[PDB]
Amino acid sequence: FEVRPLTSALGAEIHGVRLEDITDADFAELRRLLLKHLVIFIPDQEGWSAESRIAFGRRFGELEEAYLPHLDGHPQIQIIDSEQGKIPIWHTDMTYAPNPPIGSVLQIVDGPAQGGDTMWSNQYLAYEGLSAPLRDLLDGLTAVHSIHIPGLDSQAEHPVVRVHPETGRRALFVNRAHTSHIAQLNRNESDALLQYLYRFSTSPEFTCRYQWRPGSVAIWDNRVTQHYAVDDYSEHRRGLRVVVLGDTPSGDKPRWDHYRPVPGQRYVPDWVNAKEAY
Amino acid sequence: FEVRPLTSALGAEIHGVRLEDITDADFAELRRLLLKHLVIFIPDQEGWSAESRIAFGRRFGELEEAYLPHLDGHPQIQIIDSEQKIPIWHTDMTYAPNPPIGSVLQIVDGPAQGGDTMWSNQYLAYEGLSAPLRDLLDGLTAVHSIHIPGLDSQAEHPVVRVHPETGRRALFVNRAHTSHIAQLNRNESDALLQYLYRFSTSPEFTCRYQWRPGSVAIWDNRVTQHYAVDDYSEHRRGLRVVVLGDTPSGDKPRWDHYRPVPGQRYVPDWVNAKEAY
Amino acid sequence: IITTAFEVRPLTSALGAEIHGVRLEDITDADFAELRRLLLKHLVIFIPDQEGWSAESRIAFGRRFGELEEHLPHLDGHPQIQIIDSEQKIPIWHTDMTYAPNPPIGSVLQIVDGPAQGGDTMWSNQYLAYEGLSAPLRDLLDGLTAVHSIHIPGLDSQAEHPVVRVHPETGRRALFVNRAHTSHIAQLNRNESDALLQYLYRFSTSPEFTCRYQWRPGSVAIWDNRVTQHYAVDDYSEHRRGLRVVVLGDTPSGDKPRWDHYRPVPGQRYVPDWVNAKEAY
Amino acid sequence: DIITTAFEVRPLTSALGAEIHGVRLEDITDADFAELRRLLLKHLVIFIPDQEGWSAESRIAFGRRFGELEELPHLDGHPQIQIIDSEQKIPIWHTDMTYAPNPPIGSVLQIVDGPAQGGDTMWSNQYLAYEGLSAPLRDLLDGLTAVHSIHIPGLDSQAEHPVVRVHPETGRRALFVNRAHTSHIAQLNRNESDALLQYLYRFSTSPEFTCRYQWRPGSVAIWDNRVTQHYAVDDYSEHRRGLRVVVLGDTPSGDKPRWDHYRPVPGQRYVPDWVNAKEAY
Ligand code: NA
Ligand code: NA
Ligand code: NA
Ligand code: NA
């Protein structure tokens, strides 16, 4: 294939591939490129059949499946629609679950000519760019990730530094959208450290920004990336997505116990957040 | 009386007063001193009778009353008891449409050290802002709210309150109960409130009081914040009467409320945990 | 602004557009006028495949916008053509030379040697940064100025500019502060200034207001320095070399300030609320 | 585990500070001094009221019981007795002279002229600041050092000290950074250092860790500079004058650092995440 990296950190556009009837050997090459580049982009795949899209995702693992919008007859193929909302926050998908997805395949099938880019960030570089004392600290910490909305209540505890199962490389595994707090620190220390990590981890030297064209497919490794959907458009935007499951996140056993507050202790954040959203 | 200011900003201890049978004229002098000093301290009032305490508070206005812990037989005398703590800067109940105008608190049991209370002067917090920022705040309001089981209340108050008696302008936001400024978007609101909260509780604007059993504090909740230091494990018990008055008043806002778009999500710029303790 | 003469591919909604079907070497007056309209519309424009552009043509092109800056490594025999060379980087959001009373009105940059990936440049739209502020905050900023400064050996300069400037050619208002060179807002005390500028710097470089350009062989970027910031991503180790011409002549103008400068008292000390180290690298 | 029963002692807060009654410094005995020194180890700052008229010779002899005294404005004929004068202020949390390799052990200060209210001094307990950190963070800090520095006309000094020092006389660990003079943590990059120090500065001066002293006529404060910060409240306009003796001799000591100094790459630029102005007052 013809491979054109987007940035030094991550991302590559792959020309010369046809997903519809991809061979097992050509798939192995895509998998190798995904381990190298973390998110890959396959242009010009308009018309990709539902059965082929599902078979492709299933090469990676079991697919998430019917209370959410999906293609007729294919609970595996989720519909993302701007009119149904938008996610301008850095996140790693569903890390509030005990077993977050290991990756996704997304194709924007309707969208504006400009606007609605998606950015991804390289969590290997976010960890490696920390100085050695902080890497050593984070290796021994875990964090609670959680969500609390109508119809979905979930929390999970994950290592702050995840060992990728295939590469063995260590990646930061916190994200602003779903991480609540570091379990072995008090909440105020947690807020200060997470605030630094969130901003550092999404430095432009660690990211790439993709402009969607008709027919473009993005495949990303959700074990070692965050992503961000830019909210700079008003046109209708629709995507088809398949979501892949795998093993639970793994890292070092924590080197300290959970922080234990005293009875009646009140968390007073050092930084203001409003009590009412919109 | 013998009046000893605690700091330049606010606070004064008053000797030579006995609250139990205080005269109307001596009460008028206490009120004058409260408008001058914002919080006043009256030592050595052990044994103050419930009837006299209630009568004293009622000189200032209607008293709050029974779901709260209170002295048996006297729903107007609230109980602050460590075994039943508030280490956050706050102005009392500003999530209410009509927050109290002040309180009278007597620590009757407490440790020899630990458990101080601090107050801050919200006149000086406003006056210490530069002119462009004072002008901005004069035209803003803020939503104050609380959302707990059994108590859901919000209220919209001017960011700059005009004290009814002095006519002097005071900042009227506080970290405990203020949610957001209504005419700004939430992110702008967070940034401005963060600055105001820290500036308003600068040591140059505060006083710190060490309680001796029997001491009484009287404060004007229209123009102060306060903070209960959580540095003790011994039993601490206070008796409190809480006074009501008029709704907070300031300028009509100079802009409409900020209106988000239908799908808009608030993404804070600064981390707060999703789980408390 | 009507811009129908060329094939135009916008990069993001906020700003940026790649212009096809134009050759800079022998550009006509009509085609230049269209490029200038595209710059007023899109704030930064990208002209691909201009390898070999002659020095005389590059200078004549720049001079169609205004007087060129002369001095700062430059192409031998052409003081007007400045050299940006990685061997001899700027990963901080900035608007060029705003510590000067007359910052440049824009630049033309061509990366002639660079890596196949790495070294992107981002730009931000200061019109949108201002328009995205709520009305009370726009009203406040309209009446404020800020000091921009630099103090290094051989270059000490400061200038006071409106926080909100009008673009002279469009009449539209834009934010005019940037993290690299703005020091403080003149009518606030320093602590208030720090808090408000910190908010503005991050808000103004939100991804909804930016574009990110990957340089390819022969690419030329032209940007309006009056209403943008930009940022050079520092994610590469290969040699990177650009030729730049800089158009002089901006005079940032806005409303008369509505308050006097903040006046400290004798002996007053600035204590920042947020830590910065006392030693850099 | 220090017994201090000889005098009447009135602690100021749970964290630190105690007012000592029934002792006259002028002709203090060896036994009474030993008790005051125990009270200082226990309470970190002690206050001796009603000592108007304390003679210069007795003040110096008292200081010398603790160690060698520092020897610019000073009492005539007594270079050891420094004059502090509001007309010739410091509303910033600081530990004295930590930019020096050997900061002072402690000081003895008497405000001899001042307002009836205004000009309080606060102290903070750096043992409690460290002990209040969670175990992972205490473990991190135990292995770090920080550069402390000052760069003013006539005084350029820097020193590297453990972030966590052991008090040589109690064996207890205390935080050893302060906002005024600490620059950066040496084993972190500057941005990480800024974030961690900002948290520590605010946490370490929490009201639960401090005391606030109102000076009265004749008041003497004695503090241990090894395990405190302090802060002079700037809420007064009248003349305020103090007499101060400074005890030299500290060598802040802690664990061997567990990591090397952070090494930037050539040409690396420090870009703070938080704004500070470029110009003070
Ligand atoms: Na996502
Ligand atoms: Na209260
Ligand atoms: Na530039
Ligand atoms: Na000092």
XYZ file of C-alpha atoms in Angstrom, chain A residues 129-134 136-137 141 184-186 188-189 192 195-196 199-200 255-257 259 269-271, chain D residues 132-137 139-140 144 187-189 191-192 195-196 198-199 202-203 259-260 262 272-274:
52
model
C 7.068 12.669 27.520
C 6.616 12.781 31.268
C 9.826 12.979 33.276
C 11.065 9.827 34.976
C 9.827 10.627 38.521
C 6.290 11.122 37.207
C 7.435 6.068 38.081
C 4.571 7.556 40.099
C -1.596 4.441 40.365
C -4.575 6.430 45.725
C -4.433 10.257 45.949
C -6.852 12.546 47.707
C -7.523 17.598 45.362
C -4.156 16.065 44.502
C -4.175 18.864 40.056
C -5.469 18.617 34.999
C -1.780 18.655 34.057
C -3.503 19.250 28.858
C -0.066 17.717 28.332
C 1.902 0.464 44.839
C -0.342 2.095 47.460
C -3.800 1.447 48.870
C -6.941 6.947 49.732
C -12.362 21.456 44.677
C -9.556 23.966 44.312
C -10.934 25.067 40.899
C -1.210 15.837 54.843
C -0.071 14.690 51.430
C -1.178 11.212 50.427
C 1.356 8.396 50.558
C 2.165 8.272 46.812
C 2.869 11.986 46.791
C 6.989 9.079 48.357
C 7.527 11.120 45.188
C 13.071 15.253 44.692
C 14.141 16.249 38.411
C 10.912 17.314 36.664
C 10.512 19.401 33.559
C 5.891 22.563 33.337
C 5.460 19.535 35.611
C 1.898 22.278 38.343
C 3.169 20.373 41.377
C 1.347 25.387 42.581
C -0.581 22.607 44.326
C -1.663 26.410 48.181
C -2.054 23.167 50.162
C 16.375 10.519 39.790
C 18.855 12.685 37.905
C 15.855 16.799 34.079
C 4.611 28.168 31.059
C 1.103 26.758 31.078
C -0.129 29.656 33.272
